[PDB]
Design a protein around this ligand. Sequence first.
Ligand SMILES: Cc1cc2nc3c(=O)[nH]c(=O)nc-3n(C[C@H](O)[C@H](O)[C@H](O)COP(=O)(O)OP(=O)(O)OC[C@H]3O[C@@H](n4cnc5c(N)ncnc54)[C@H](O)[C@@H]3O)c2cc1C
Ligand SMILES: Cc1cc2nc3c(=O)[nH]c(=O)nc-3n(C[C@H](O)[C@H](O)[C@H](O)COP(=O)(O)OP(=O)(O)OC[C@H]3O[C@@H](n4cnc5c(N)ncnc54)[C@H](O)[C@@H]3O)c2cc1C
Ligand SMILES: Cc1cc2nc3c(=O)[nH]c(=O)nc-3n(C[C@H](O)[C@H](O)[C@H](O)COP(=O)(O)OP(=O)(O)OC[C@H]3O[C@@H](n4cnc5c(N)ncnc54)[C@H](O)[C@@H]3O)c2cc1C
Ligand SMILES: Cc1ncc(C[n+]2csc(CCOP(=O)(O)OP(=O)(O)O)c2C)c(N)n1
Ligand SMILES: Cc1ncc(C[n+]2csc(CCOP(=O)(O)OP(=O)(O)O)c2C)c(N)n1
Ligand SMILES: Cc1ncc(C[n+]2csc(CCOP(=O)(O)OP(=O)(O)O)c2C)c(N)n1
Ligand SMILES: [Mg+2]
Ligand SMILES: [Mg+2]
Ligand SMILES: [Mg+2]
Lengths: 535, 536, 535
Amino acid sequence: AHSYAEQLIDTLEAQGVKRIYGLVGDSLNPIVDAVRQSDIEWVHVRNEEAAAFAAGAESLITGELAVCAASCGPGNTHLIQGLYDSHRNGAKVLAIASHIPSAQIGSTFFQETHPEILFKECSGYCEMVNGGEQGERILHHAIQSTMAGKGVSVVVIPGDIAKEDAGDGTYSNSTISSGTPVVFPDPTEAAALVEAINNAKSVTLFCGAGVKNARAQVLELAEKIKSPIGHALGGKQYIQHENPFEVGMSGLLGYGACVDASNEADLLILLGTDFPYSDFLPKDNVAQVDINGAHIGRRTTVKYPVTGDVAATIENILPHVKEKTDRSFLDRMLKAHERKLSSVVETYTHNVEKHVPIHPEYVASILNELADKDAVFTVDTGMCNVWHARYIENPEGTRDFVGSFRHGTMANALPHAIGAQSVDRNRQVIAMCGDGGLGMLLGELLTVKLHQLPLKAVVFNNSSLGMVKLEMLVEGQPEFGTDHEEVNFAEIAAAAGIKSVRITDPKKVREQLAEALAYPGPVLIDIVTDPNALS
Amino acid sequence: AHSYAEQLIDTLEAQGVKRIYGLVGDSLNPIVDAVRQSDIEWVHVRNEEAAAFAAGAESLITGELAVCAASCGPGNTHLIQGLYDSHRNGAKVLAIASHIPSAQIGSTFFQETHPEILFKECSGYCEMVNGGEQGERILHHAIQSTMAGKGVSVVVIPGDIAKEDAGDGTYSNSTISSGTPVVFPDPTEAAALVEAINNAKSVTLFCGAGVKNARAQVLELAEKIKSPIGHALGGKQYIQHENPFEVGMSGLLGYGACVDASNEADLLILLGTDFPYSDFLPKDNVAQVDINGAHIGRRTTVKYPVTGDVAATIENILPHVKEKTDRSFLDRMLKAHERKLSSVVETYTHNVEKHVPIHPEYVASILNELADKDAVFTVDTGMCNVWHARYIENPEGTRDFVGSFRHGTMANALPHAIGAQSVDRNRQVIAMCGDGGLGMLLGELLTVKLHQLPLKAVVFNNSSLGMVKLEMLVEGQPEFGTDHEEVNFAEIAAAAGIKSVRITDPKKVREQLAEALAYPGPVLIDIVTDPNALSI
Amino acid sequence: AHSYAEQLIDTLEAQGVKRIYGLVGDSLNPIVDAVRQSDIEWVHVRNEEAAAFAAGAESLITGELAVCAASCGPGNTHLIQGLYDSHRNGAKVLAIASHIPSAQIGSTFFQETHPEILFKECSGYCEMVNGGEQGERILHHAIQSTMAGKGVSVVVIPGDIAKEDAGDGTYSNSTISSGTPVVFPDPTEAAALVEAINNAKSVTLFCGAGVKNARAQVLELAEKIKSPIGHALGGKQYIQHENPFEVGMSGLLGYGACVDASNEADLLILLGTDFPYSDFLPKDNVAQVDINGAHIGRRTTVKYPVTGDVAATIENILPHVKEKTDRSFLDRMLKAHERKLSSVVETYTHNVEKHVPIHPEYVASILNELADKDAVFTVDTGMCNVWHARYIENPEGTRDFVGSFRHGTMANALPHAIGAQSVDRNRQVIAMCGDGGLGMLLGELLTVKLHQLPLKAVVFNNSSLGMVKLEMLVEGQPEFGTDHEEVNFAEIAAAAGIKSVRITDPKKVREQLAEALAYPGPVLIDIVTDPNALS
Ligand SMILES: Cc1cc2nc3c(=O)[nH]c(=O)nc-3n(C[C@H](O)[C@H](O)[C@H](O)COP(=O)(O)OP(=O)(O)OC[C@H]3O[C@@H](n4cnc5c(N)ncnc54)[C@H](O)[C@@H]3O)c2cc1C
Ligand SMILES: Cc1cc2nc3c(=O)[nH]c(=O)nc-3n(C[C@H](O)[C@H](O)[C@H](O)COP(=O)(O)OP(=O)(O)OC[C@H]3O[C@@H](n4cnc5c(N)ncnc54)[C@H](O)[C@@H]3O)c2cc1C
Ligand SMILES: Cc1cc2nc3c(=O)[nH]c(=O)nc-3n(C[C@H](O)[C@H](O)[C@H](O)COP(=O)(O)OP(=O)(O)OC[C@H]3O[C@@H](n4cnc5c(N)ncnc54)[C@H](O)[C@@H]3O)c2cc1C
Ligand SMILES: Cc1ncc(C[n+]2csc(CCOP(=O)(O)OP(=O)(O)O)c2C)c(N)n1
Ligand SMILES: Cc1ncc(C[n+]2csc(CCOP(=O)(O)OP(=O)(O)O)c2C)c(N)n1
Ligand SMILES: Cc1ncc(C[n+]2csc(CCOP(=O)(O)OP(=O)(O)O)c2C)c(N)n1
Ligand SMILES: [Mg+2]
Ligand SMILES: [Mg+2]
Ligand SMILES: [Mg+2]
């Protein structure tokens, strides 16, 4: 490795990077020449935004570093949406932002931007390379920052400097710390939490993504104190399945007795969650356990703050928590949960199989039953979040859920599916697309075709910005700009060389979805759904 | 108008705004409720990036304010590429960037970003609304800043504040200054330019977009001092046509004697240009006239700097410039121009009508001949810039050229054509698309269908990132990542409900293009072109 | 508390804030009206830069929240130097940056700046108040972010909004998490460190500020593996005293066998340090333990990275680390260290103690001997860092050292001393000032007089930018712009109403310093020191 471009790629290969998503051009050419000589695969995308989404999804699935790359000015500017999403999701992503020739910086040159400034909000590390040795340092610092969980890292590289001599290897020779530390709470904070639990007659646990490695501990605590368990959308994958305490979700796409259980308990314990809808949370007596102390109390009054890991905190407090024999609150909340879910099933199950346009809730129920027990589900922002949250389950805990749950951008599903599918072509990947989201990055159908990624793109084609239609109904606003003339995505996918099917009959949804999911290759399933569907 | 959302829309309609390009959602809903109750058309796009490009193109065509709007966080984040392009092009654009509810700012809320910080590099004005009266003020300042030529303006509006009471009208009642001032040069700088011209035995004029309102003055000066006229890409629309002094373009996509005339004249005069390729410009004896004094001397050694308008500077100096009777340099440069262009024709014009895959230069020649004399051409960044610069002409000066000439982003052609066509459906709009550029924002074919914009999308389908293929050949780099499996854009357009045709035979290009351009509706013409074809 | 200004001050008082350093004006007036009606003391400063340094120093001394406040535009702009210093030092500081009236934002008004953008690099949290309820939220998030160790927090408050209605109390009622969690390492990283230690025949420990709560563990590990212990400047306060393995410091102001021990050991272990001078560190076999994974390998090749707390990591690995019986390396390094220190004392003690102009090393030795065992020492950036590092010791560990060790700004000593002294007027505070540093913020002598803070300002008056004189000598540059005509700081302090003494005779330094340190009130000691004493 004589040039900085070669040293950068060799360092990524030695770190286990297998693929780089991007689109070649100008200042990125020396870097793509180094990827050509390496054993890293170059994954060409139609729009660099999709490369940043794909890298973020690959990272969420592998737990390892993922990389995207883009040319100068407008090239790396397209990464921004996907970098905000990957950053909010805590993905381990390195973005290679090629930059204009260093001699032209400051001269308002052709394509000039300041990415080293622009990307400061959507990254935990973002610096510009000014030479070989310094480039080697900031590449190490970028990788180490993202592997430590600080979010996206961006390395800005002027094209001429990528062709200059590499550094001496001092920083590229380092081992990267990528382990997960065990964060025990401060004994004083743990004691206050023990006191709050023992003195509450009824407790509710509200779990988020932070309980990922604490399932056994959360269930063990819930059994001891007879607490209903609710979950934020980010914790659904980990705590909803095989859980006899489950009371659902809160917020506008919530369901069941979670809102009641959270607001009626003597004590609410927020476990690894940053659920932002304050109006749904109580203020009277709340505890919060979070690994990042700065996140505690962001969403409601917290009287018992605990900086610590969920599993380690529960292991620390369990011997001091007295077993509660009064289950009346848990039983009352489980009955309320069942009564709410049964009222929906009793009212709507009878005529859903005959309703035209197809009910998206019926599609999601079938998708849950037909998809593999270890499938990856990617979820487009919009009404697909409602269908995923209420109908897609994770029995056996081997399914992965990837979405724009925090940044909330449309169009993530197909590019997320491209990244997730690239990890293992023998694993089923289902993209729950919206017609709005798919239309927004439609050219990524050409990426699916080019790389023959055998993902299953299920389009909930309601010819509408469905979620906006719902917002306007809630606000009392006459609908405007949300519904438009129908689009045939099955014909568009067929024209792009992808196997497709158009589903319009509710009586054929199950069989046609089954055949499409069994097809050994990419498939687009265009389902004509009701834009006004809601239970 | 009780709410700030209604006051904002009423202010835009009083300014003559006819359309807003965008995609509705969350915090933008109160604003679109006001647009619903107004004269303004709501133009739904598939990706907000296309709304920012469309607004920029509409503004370049009308010379008036154009508006784009987007929802909070990820919605307005998508405007960024189009805002950089509109800003670099000097478009008069207002971007309505809806923002998260004000009570959630600073709480790392769902969809939270800081657009009021993010858009500072791609705008001349960018501020956040925090109340009704203050919102009315910054709406005025944003419009006034962009109408005065300071580039894009961004107004960031938290959704809840759009529903609050409007201001009292003090700033919305103002007349906006949109006139063009006449910037005469400092007499000392003009005197130095007069002296430099009279002492030079030979002069060359190199013109850019700044000569837009100075054609008569530039030609009058060129006739008096017998100076060849070359041009930067941004000035091509204005000075190339009906010009007996024309010696072409400079830079890598240049042609003709422009580089010789610029480097051999006793004095080179840069007129309204910021041509960035320094290696092609002389350093010895250069004058520069620019309306923005900060731009002077950015690209080469300038000995005679002049802060001033091109037309006003030329009118100021003309009575003091002595007529040059010696035409030798002009004639020698016009002959050099012809010798350079004839060497290309002698080498490459051999069986072009039979070359397979179709030669893109042949397609561009035919497009130049068949398109209307007042057509709008939008140009995708890449090899289409080469075909546009060398083969699309502007006889009569009634054609408009819109492209990403300064920001250099791919995928601008179709969204620019959507904005340009929306101005007047009876005017022909031709989009010169690249397969890479069209694939990058492919969903905007659904926007063309939805609004039935009768534009003609000509896809130079070379199954390649053509320009990158050329860069790698020049740098001595083995080709990689540029060429990919073929895509049928005609079938994709047909599936999207747009009339289309696929052209693979060079003997049918002329007739099939003629039929497509005559069709009264949107058409996509997918032309399979040679990725290796180039006349050097 | 009806207004947001009152709610803000009530929230700070409920958090235990006793003082606010600042300078009143325009948009800050409603806030100082609320301070007037509270138990919080208002500490008027001459320059808002000093208020930010004072808050940072108070926080480093108490381990609790400290607050500074400034008026709109130019007022809060003056905080910036002190906020960079407090941020780099990890101080727990809240800066109240008053802002122009909200109706004028975006109109290029009189005094308009964008502090909510300007202060992003010198803070972990920086947001603008736009209403009562939102102001209450961001005040909580700012306090919680700084109390969790994320650095300075800035709250930007338009003056008119400070007078508007307060929020409902939801976020102000929260308990703030200020505990210290116990971070155990990932077992795989700890196992690699155990293997590296057991395979090394000789080990050296290089400690920084991160070993503050790990003294016992560091000494315990050092005894087991017979390792010399060196330290970075930030760790001097904690690991230098009562340490039989001590081999000094590294870098240009270093001394003793630290550089030799670090570079000759088979394994170097970086413990809680971010020492930036890479040229003094080895590259061949280095381990690093840091609580922030992003900091690992920033300064040299790290082969054994460990994300974890120093004390918890050592407790975790100790039972697996074999006792090293070979003491040869330790004894060789301790003999080298002792010979280096004793040789200097034997050779120079007489010339330094009698030298005219007074030798600054003699002044620092006297200060070490005469100052209380629990004194606070503040250190001005420049040659005073050399005198502090080499001669001020911390026997019993009850002294505090405050300086601009990371941001490296001049003029911090007197403002740091004002903050440290304000905590407890019965505790001795010694400010080691430079003539350049004191002259830079000379008006703060009026603050010392106004508040009668009984600190002892020792001016090392060498009529020079001493450290710059040394830089130019090392670079081979002819001296220029460093030395200027003598200033009489004792006469200036006397004119400002402060008790002062001018010391020019080395035979009187000890006696006159003893009298000055015993004086019950503020004292400025102007010592004419040798400008050619460059260590
Ligand atoms: C259209 C749309 C609508 C939405 N509607 C809703 C809705 O109605 N209901 C809903 O529930 N969601 C909703 N969401 C998502 C919502 O905005 C939030 O993103 C989500 O609820 C947060 O999930 P979380 O708390 O699991 O994850 P995060 O917000 O990522 O929080 C995880 C937290 O755990 C902490 N943590 C991580 N590891 C550990 C550890 N080991 N120990 C302790 N703490 C740790 C992190 O620091 C963080 O604070 C919606 C999303 C979309 C796109
Ligand atoms: C792929 C690609 C390749 C390119 N290759 C080339 C190439 O080889 N050759 C080439 O020519 N271009 C090339 N371009 C474009 C090139 O980068 C520049 O953007 C362009 O040449 C600048 O044109 P301009 O000077 O007319 O406009 P601008 O750069 O916009 O400059 C116009 C100037 O006029 C000034 N001005 C405005 N109004 C007035 C007035 N009334 N009076 C006086 N001054 C005024 C402005 O302040 C400004 O400084 C390329 C573009 C692309 C996309
Ligand atoms: C004029 C001047 C000259 C200087 N010259 C020198 C010189 O020659 N020599 C020198 O030594 N210094 C010198 N300094 C200071 C030097 O620049 C550094 O600031 C200093 O050496 C860093 O000290 P540190 O590593 O202890 O602290 P920091 O740089 O603050 O690093 C402490 C580290 O410990 C980590 N940490 C914190 N808590 C824990 C925990 N519980 N467990 C594990 N890790 C934890 C932190 O994450 C951080 O990485 C100079 C300063 C000045 C002003
Ligand atoms: C980039 C972007 N633009 C706009 C929005 C606002 N928004 C959120 S959901 C939604 C509608 C999504 O439509 P579609 O993808 O068809 O999903 P549906 O709700 O109809 O299932 C919109 C406009 C957004 N989140 N991201
Ligand atoms: C958003 C963006 N990404 C990348 C580039 C770099 N780039 C400039 S031209 C080009 C190739 C364009 O391909 P296509 O649109 O097919 O045009 P062609 O040159 O093949 O005619 C590329 C990759 C860019 N300018 N903008
Ligand atoms: C604000 C600031 N300006 C400049 C410097 C550069 N600098 C570092 S130390 C120093 C000299 C300090 O002089 P003085 O305070 O008299 O201390 P001395 O070295 O003479 O003891 C200078 C100029 C700095 N660190 N901070
Ligand atoms: Mg939809
Ligand atoms: Mg192409
Ligand atoms: Mg000095």
